[PDB]
């Protein structure tokens with residue numbers, strides 16, 4: 001009912017959309033933590049100090065970790081920023097990040113007041 005609750009509902013809706021089949025073609029690299037060892041990315045954790053992914057965001061939302069929309073958005077944007085920091089800008093995963101961030105930013109902007 002309250003403002004914080006209402007804004008977190010909007011955030012949860014966005015999260016559900018980002019994890020939905022509608023966006024799966026470009027969202028899937030963000031579903032789980034980057035497994036650096038599995039992907040042969042042995043410099044990943046030297047470059048990315050604070051990894052983030054949608055499963056972690058989901059766990060935090062479920063645990064009521066996020067106190068407001070701003071805190072939620074910071075994690076989603078951290079996830080994208082990590083991608084832009086680590087990967088050359090012409091790489092496929094970056095194109096996918098850009099597309100998912102477009103989904104995120106446009107819906108996040110429709111936050112209720």
Ligand SMILES: Cc1cc(-c2nc(Cl)cn2Cc2ccccc2)cn(C)c1=O
Pocket residue numbers: 028029030034035039041082083086087092093096
């Ligand atoms: C460096 C990096 C790898 C992945 C990743 N996760 C899976 Cl599972 C496969 N990959 C590699 C990939 C290669 C080509 C296209 C998409 C992902 C995801 N993110 C966000 C990254 O920053």
